[PDB]
DNA sequence: CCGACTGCGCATCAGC
DNA sequence: GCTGATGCGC
DNA sequence: GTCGG
């Protein structure tokens with residue numbers, strides 16, 4: 001990419017602040033600056049030119065100047081040499097091991113992949129599955145495999161109840177040629193904001209996908225959100241496909257547009273769009289857009305009949321999913 | 327200067 | 343058990 | 353770490 005070196009550096013800084021410093025706002029600030037620089041359609045020549053962008057301030061401008069002059073950042077070179085930071089950054093790459101658990105594991109002398117595998121009884125369920133598929137979960141998914149996965153999910157859901165609608169969202173819906181995981185939005189006319197007329201709506205879909213050996217593991221599962229593991233079937237004498245992360249979110253059918261806007265993302269795009277909504281006097285989540293009163297209490301959900309209606313309330317021109325990869 | 331920073335489901339834990 | 347806070351990942 | 357008022 002055009003400024004890949006700078007955005008890589010800012011992302012590494014973001015990950016340091018989240019994982020090691022446990023400084024969530026610095027993490028988000030670095031991600032915001034990386035995102036704004038990644039969309040900028042010029043090869044940046046100086047930190048002063050970058051500082052013109054929203055989210056880039058004095059400190060990041062100085063780092064950009066160092067990086068442009070030298071190709072490196074001394075701050076990051078030292079972080080990369082710190083064993084505790086190195087150990088924590090590694091451990092958090094396992095799904096279910098966050099900043100707190102990683103630091104605690106290092107305290108206890110659990111610092112490597114070998115240590116983790118030798119101490120599975122110290123891991124909770126999520127962490128245990130994250131360790132099992134550590135290698136697979138770092139592989140990306142070609143869009144061609146996403147289409148095969150889409151075809152299984154939609155057809156198996158149809159077999160359970162033809163009134164379900166499953167929608168693959170995430171980067172897939174934004175048109176990307178590869179995805180990190182699969183995100184599935186699910187609706188059923190029995191589940192609305194007014195009532196739940198049928199139980200086990202998500203459970204029945206999950207069990208059917210398990211029945212056919214598509215879903216292989218469960219990280220967490222409640223009434224509306226499933227997070228787990230899946231795998232495409234392979235052919236005779238073929239190597240097996242990697243196991244893949246899959247999330248399924250059951251959303252009330254009358255709130256589909258807020259749900260699909262949310263599950264399409266990107267995460268930064270949602271963050272930016274919700275921040276803008278607040279400046280316009282609205283709050284947006286995956287269910288509703290609501291006005292904010294004088295006191296800041298959210299009012300009643302506003303009528304929504306398309307994704308564009310949401311954009312219209314906050315006076316943004318509509319952006320197709322392909323243009324939401326921030 | 328400095329308060330605020332997008333918004334939330336599920337797992338886990340502490341206190342009662 | 344409930345309720346609330348925290349961790350985690352979305 | 354950045355920024356709006």
Ligand SMILES: Nc1ncnc2c1ncn2[C@@H]1C[C@@H](O)[C@@H](COP(=O)(O)OP(=O)(O)[C@@](F)(Cl)P(=O)(O)O)O1
Nearest residue numbers: 170171179180181183262263264265266267270352
């Ligand atoms: N912190 C967040 N705040 C608001 N919305 C959020 C947040 N995290 C994830 N979301 C999102 C948006 C959407 O992409 C969805 C999917 O979450 P995701 O982590 O799978 O992101 P993605 O866009 O699908 C991807 F490009 Cl990273 P991937 O294809 O590699 O997986 O839920």
Ligand SMILES: [Cl-]
Nearest residue numbers: 023024025026
């Ligand atoms: Cl912070």
Ligand SMILES: [Mg+2]
Nearest residue numbers: 170171181183
């Ligand atoms: Mg995804």
Ligand code: NA
Nearest residue numbers: 051052053056
């Ligand atoms: Na700026």
Ligand code: NA
Nearest residue numbers: 092094095097
């Ligand atoms: Na992790």
Ligand code: NA
Nearest residue numbers: 181182183247
């Ligand atoms: Na996901």
